[PDB]
Amino acid sequence: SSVFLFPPKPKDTLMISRTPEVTCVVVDVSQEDPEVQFNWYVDGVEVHNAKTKPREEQFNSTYRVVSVLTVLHQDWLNGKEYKCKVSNKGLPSSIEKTISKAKGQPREPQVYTLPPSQEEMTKNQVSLTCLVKGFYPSDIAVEWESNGQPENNYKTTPPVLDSDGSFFLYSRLTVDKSRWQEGNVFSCSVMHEALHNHYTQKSLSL
Amino acid sequence: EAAASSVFLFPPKPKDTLMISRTPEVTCVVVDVSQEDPEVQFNWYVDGVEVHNAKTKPREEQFNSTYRVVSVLTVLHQDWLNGKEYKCKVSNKGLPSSIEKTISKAKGQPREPQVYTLPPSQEEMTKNQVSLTCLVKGFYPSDIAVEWESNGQPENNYKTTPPVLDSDGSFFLYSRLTVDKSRWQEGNVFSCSVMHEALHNHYTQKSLSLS
Ligand SMILES: *[C@@H]1O[C@H](CO[C@@H]2O[C@@H](C)[C@@H](O)[C@@H](O)[C@@H]2O)[C@@H](O[C@@H]2O[C@H](CO)[C@@H](O[C@@H]3O[C@H](CO[C@H]4O[C@H](CO)[C@@H](O)[C@H](O)[C@@H]4O[C@@H]4O[C@H](CO)[C@@H](O[C@@H]5O[C@H](CO)[C@H](O)[C@H](O)[C@H]5O)[C@H](O)[C@H]4NC(C)=O)[C@@H](O)[C@H](O[C@H]4O[C@H](CO)[C@@H](O)[C@H](O)[C@@H]4O[C@@H]4O[C@H](CO)[C@@H](O)[C@H](O)[C@H]4NC(C)=O)[C@@H]3O)[C@H](O)[C@H]2NC(C)=O)[C@H](O)[C@H]1NC(C)=O
Ligand SMILES: *[C@@H]1O[C@H](CO)[C@@H](O[C@@H]2O[C@H](CO)[C@@H](O[C@@H]3O[C@H](CO[C@H]4O[C@H](CO)[C@@H](O)[C@H](O)[C@@H]4O[C@@H]4O[C@H](CO)[C@@H](O[C@@H]5O[C@H](CO)[C@H](O)[C@H](O)[C@H]5O)[C@H](O)[C@H]4NC(C)=O)[C@@H](O)[C@H](O[C@H]4O[C@H](CO)[C@@H](O)[C@H](O)[C@@H]4O[C@@H]4O[C@H](CO)[C@@H](O)[C@H](O)[C@H]4NC(C)=O)[C@@H]3O)[C@H](O)[C@H]2NC(C)=O)[C@H](O)[C@H]1NC(C)=O
């Protein structure tokens, strides 16, 4: 049996309208194993409002179990520690995993958009780049849109630790050259705790 | 199984395999070695043939009451890039069991990286330092090295993202060099150098200056 503990999604912690939660996952549960149980703690204080799903077989003939705990936004953002403790009913062993927001003064992401290189302009598709740098902690969401509508054809690097202790990443949106040369307006939007309203967006066009 | 999981085998650095004057090494590491354990021994094999030039370091104590033992094998650049398999077999002296790990370069047709340089965003130009960006894309395997230079000298205030798997099965990454706005303003030429097995002479460079 092996245990994984996952943080809330950056968008959830940052929107008053959304609900952040932490997720505790147990794999390699033998069909023989007694009921997998969860005890959840917030800064050492046990809480009882988690939601556990029955075990589910996997493509390797093992079972998997998932417990979800809703968190308060300010609790997560204030650096509270979430601990999941996993055991089997009537056995003594336990495994504990903990997760919390990185500690340290939050720092505002600097967001810059970059057009395609002239050398790439010879191709049928071109790259639109959004540099996001100087942010702390690394929890962040980056999306693209055009003329107000979500664009999907992008990939974003993981946050990378910079020499000054902040993070940066790049997001690359691929578009048809014709759409770029038509003058369409593309936008990068970034959500982060150290932004006003937790949100900023920057435009990019020819 | 707890035994199998305490041997790790690491590849050489991408830059070391691409220049025959550098020294690419495969590294076999055994952790959780006990003080009650006889000497940790290594046998190394290249495509199943035993080689004898590895260098094994004495056990080094870790701050968790265990020892780590490392063996380092120098590899021929051409062997690694041609896909030979490297095997490390670990045993304890006087006992018969062993644990084997194998590594080799990623399989798949290599693909040449396209390298583009991008100047700072006009909005960044109001700052004291600006970002010069190198976009490297379309490459395979993901083994790659990127560095920046100017006027002969390595520039070293730069950081590079890990490769990211793209939809077509190739990789891309970005490297960001940070430089005083003044040095960009003065018309200094900055260059992004890229080393990858699918590049002619394993190396290409692209430069950027104020325009
Ligand atoms: C007691 O302590 C020891 C020592 O740790 C140290 O001391 C303690 C007290 C602490 O202070 C601790 O923080 C200190 O580090 C503990 O030893 C550790 O044991 C764990 C396992 O229990 C090992 O975990 C693996 O880590 C691998 C990555 O290791 C590298 O990166 C970490 C940092 O992220 C470093 O700390 C490591 O040292 C490794 O660093 C690399 O080392 C290479 C060899 O030197 C370097 O390459 C060489 O570099 C030189 C120049 O320097 C030349 O260039 C050479 O040419 C080159 O070869 C390399 O640069 C360097 N990198 C970096 C960034 O530093 C993980 O890869 C590995 O994950 C695999 O296995 C997992 C299973 O455990 C699995 O979950 C993973 O998914 C992954 O699985 C693999 O995946 C691939 C494909 O995805 C598959 O093909 C594989 O088959 C698959 N393998 C599987 C499934 O097995 C592990 O997480 C850890 O490495 C080790 N530390 C050290 C220092 O040895 C010990 O555990 C403690 N014991 C107890 C009881 O507490
Ligand atoms: C049988 O088949 C099973 C299914 O295929 C298989 O189960 C897998 O077992 C693996 C090992 O036993 C296990 O591997 C781990 O994976 C960790 C990351 O997992 C995520 O990403 C995977 C893709 O890489 C996905 O497949 C996973 O499902 C998981 O995906 C995430 O899922 C969560 C929860 O559902 C989700 O979060 C929630 O999303 C919802 C949306 O509905 C909400 O928004 C919630 O609010 C939100 O919380 C994520 O979005 C989702 N993400 C993604 C990207 O999909 C990986 O991190 C583990 O590595 C760590 O631990 C190992 C040691 O075990 C270390 O070696 C390794 O280096 C990592 O070390 C950690 O590093 C951290 C620092 O960054 C540090 O903090 C940790 O302490 C440290 N841990 C250490 C040192 O131990 C690990 O490799 C895999 O996830 C299982 N897959 C599934 C689907 O469960 C089973 O093994 C098979 N049996 C066999 C083969 O015998």
Author numbering:
A (entry chain A): 238 to 443
B (entry chain B): 234 to 444
Please give me the paper's original passages concerning this structure:
The Fc region of the immunoglobulin (IgG) antibody, which is the focus of this study, can have interactions with Fc gamma receptors (FcγR) and first subcomponent of the C1 complex (C1q) that mediate antibody-dependent cellular cytotoxicity (ADCC), complement-dependent cytotoxicity (CDC), antibody-dependent cellular phagocytosis (ADCP), induction of secretion of mediators, endocytosis of opsonized particles, as well as modulation of tissue and serum half-life through interaction with the neonatal Fc receptor (FcRn). We describe here the functional and structural characteristics of three novel silent Fc designs: huIgG1 sigma (IgG1σ), which is a variant of huIgG1, and huIgG4 sigma1 (IgG4σ1) and huIgG4 sigma2 (IgG4σ2), which are variants of huIgG4. To assess the impact of the silencing mutations on the structure of the Fc, crystal structures of the Fc fragments of huIgG1σ, huIgG4σ1, and huIgG4σ2 were determined to resolutions of 1.90 Å, 1.90 Å, and 1.85 Å, respectively. Crystal structures and simulations of these Fc variants reveal altered conformational preferences within the lower hinge and BC and FG loops relative to wild-type IgG, providing a structural rationalization for diminished Fc receptor engagement.
Compared to huIgG4 PAA, huIgG4σ1 and huIgG4σ2 have two and three additional mutations, respectively, for a total of five and six mutations. For the huIgG4σ2 Fc structure, residues S238-L443 and E233-S444 were modeled for the respective chains. The lower hinge residues in both chains of the huIgG4σ1 Fc structure and in chain B of the huIgG4σ2 Fc structure adopt a kinked conformation like that described above for huIgG1σ. In contrast, the same residues in chain A of the huIgG4σ2 structure adopt a wild-type-like extended conformation. The results of our in vitro and in vivo studies demonstrated that huIgG4σ1 and huIgG4σ2 are more silent than huIgG4 PAA. Given that all the mutations for these variants were localized to the lower hinge region and that structurally the dispositions of the BC and FG loops were identical to those observed in structures of wild-type huIgG4 Fc, these mutations could function either by directly disrupting hinge:receptor interactions or indirectly by altering lower hinge backbone conformation. Structures of huIgG1 in complex with FcγRI and FcγRIIIa have shown the importance for L235 in receptor engagement. This residue was mutated to alanine in both huIgG1σ as well as huIgG4σ1/2, and this mutation likely has a direct effect on receptor engagement. All Fc variants demonstrating this kinked conformation commonly share mutation of a conserved proline at position 238 and have an altered ability to engage Fc receptor. The Ab1 huIgG4 PAA shows a first transition at 69.5 ± 0.1 °C, while the huIgG4σ1 is at 62.0 ± 0.2 °C and the huIgG4σ2 is at 61.2 ± 0.6 °C, suggesting that the huIgG4 PAA is more thermally stable than its variants.
